[PDB]
Amino acid sequence: IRKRQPFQEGFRITYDDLEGGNIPALLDVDAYQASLKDDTEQQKKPVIKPLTEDSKKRSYNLISNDSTFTQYRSWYLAYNYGDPQ
Known part of the structure; x- marks a missing residue:
């Protein structure tokens, strides 16, 4: 990663x-799958279920419970998809 204007320090x-x-x-x-499959065993699939923690219960530091974003941010992500301006 470099700085477009380089001379300014x-x-x-x-x-x-x-x-x-x-x-x-x-x-x-897993959740989505399960839901769909037992709906099958019986629609009503909690696809949605952003996962909160990992196996060892380490949090993913979500911005909130009802959002699809985490407090993690990436440079790559931004340069590619962020604001071009």
């Missing part, structure tokens, strides 16, 4: 600098 990048580059959460595959 300094190159520091902080969390606030990655506007709009918030990393999407990972959906709960």
